Amino acid sequence: ALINPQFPYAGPVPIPGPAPTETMPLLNYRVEGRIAGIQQARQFMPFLQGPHRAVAEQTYHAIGTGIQMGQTFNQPLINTQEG
Amino acid sequence: NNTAFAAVGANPLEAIYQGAGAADCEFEEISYTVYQSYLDQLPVGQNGY
User: Fold this and answer.
1) Rounded CA gap, A53 and B43, in Å?
2) ∠ CA(A38), CA(B45), CA(A52), 5° rounding?
3) B39, B41, B42, B49: which to substitute to probe chain A, counting the most A Cβ within 10 Å?
4) Rounded Cα–Cα distance for residues B4 and B16 (Å)
5) Are the C-beta atoms of residues B5 and B17 closer than 8 Å to each other?
6) B16: which of A43, A58, A81, B4 fits an S-S bond (Cβ 3.0–4.6 Å)?
């Protein structure tokens, strides 16, 4: 702010002001609020809580069976070298 | 038919069409389809939602 003498800035907005209204009042709000609809315990989703496999491992079962059977052919006898 | 067509010179505020042929205009049919937008799943914990 600058004040300049001799033209000085009025020393106030004075008493000639026009009170325009008495509408100043905010009427307090008084209220009762009830949000009470029956609630049912459940919601349907496509899927909740699953941690789906991105790849599975290979998996398997097992079997064996049979017996011990055989047809054989042997090497001929040979002269013994030494000993 | 009463609200949708306004004669020349009549108030068009609530009307769809206005003109010299208004008196002989008629809807043949109207169809509506209502779609509801909402939020589902909502996660539930020890206090409800």
Assistant:
1) 23
2) 115
3) B41
4) 5
5) yes
6) B4
Resolution of the structure, angstroms = 4.2
- Residue A12 to residues A3, A4, A9, A28, A29: CA-CA distances in angstroms? 13, 15, 8, 35, 38
B39 touches chain A (CB under 8 A): no
C-alpha B17: how far from its chain's center? 15
A to B CB pairs, distance under 8 Å: 9
Q: B40 and B28 in contact (C-beta within 8 Å)?
A: no
Experimental method: X-ray
**Pairwise CB contact (< 8 Å): B44 & A39:** no
- Give the separation between CA A69 and CA A66, rounded to whole angstroms: 9
Amino acid of residue A25: P
